[PDB]
């Protein structure tokens, strides 16, 4: 029953047509799908596979291997919080405590409305600005709760 909405099917065909070979577009397609749904629908993999002219098990292997993709928790806005060495030294725990004070959740958990999910990730390539977090594609240094509160309020 699951067909992709047209606006998205169009966007996926763009990626599939961009590289010389269709299969090369799997990751961009998955990023696009996740962007659209706030997660990767398991049932989305079948027809994606058709469009890439690949078997489903291949697509399933790829989703499972790449950490950015999530098939379990729908979320409008993913807060990626760095848990690697430099951000740890410079105050990952204060950022998380301050997320918890503001959002009522810990790493792994989605809020009840499905608005914010905290995702602990490896080094985000911005160690000079530790502690670091993203909200979807937007990246920021954590300074304080007061400063964090006003950033998060920009996401509705």
């Amino acid at each position: 029953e699951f067909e992709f909405p047209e606006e998205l099917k169009t966007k996926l065909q763009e990626h599939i047509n961009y590289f010389p070979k269709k299969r090369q577009a799997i990751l961009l397609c998955l990023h696009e799908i996740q962007n659209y749904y706030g997660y990767i629908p398991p049932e989305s993999l079948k027809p994606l596979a058709d469009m890439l002219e690949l078997p489903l098990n291949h697509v399933e292997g790829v989703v499972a291997f790449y950490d950015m993709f999530d098939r379990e928790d729908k979320a409008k806005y993913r807060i990626r919080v760095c848990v690697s060495i430099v951000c740890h030294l410079m105050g990952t725990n204060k950022l998380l405590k301050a997320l918890e004070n503001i959002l009522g959740i810990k790493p792994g958990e989605v809020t009840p409305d499905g608005k914010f999910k905290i995702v602990p990730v490896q080094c985000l390539g911005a160690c000079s600005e530790a502690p670091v977090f993203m909200v979807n594609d937007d990246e920021y240094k954590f300074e304080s709760e007061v400063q964090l509160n006003e950033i998060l309020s920009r996401y509705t």
Binding site: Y18, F19, P20, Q24, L27, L28, L30, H31, F65, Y66, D67, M68, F69, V121, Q122
Partner: peptide, 10 residues
């Protein structure tokens, strides 16, 4: 020049 994205693997 094609631009490809990773998806979370070092």
């Amino acid at each position: 020049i094609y631009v490809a994205r990773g998806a979370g693997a070092y």
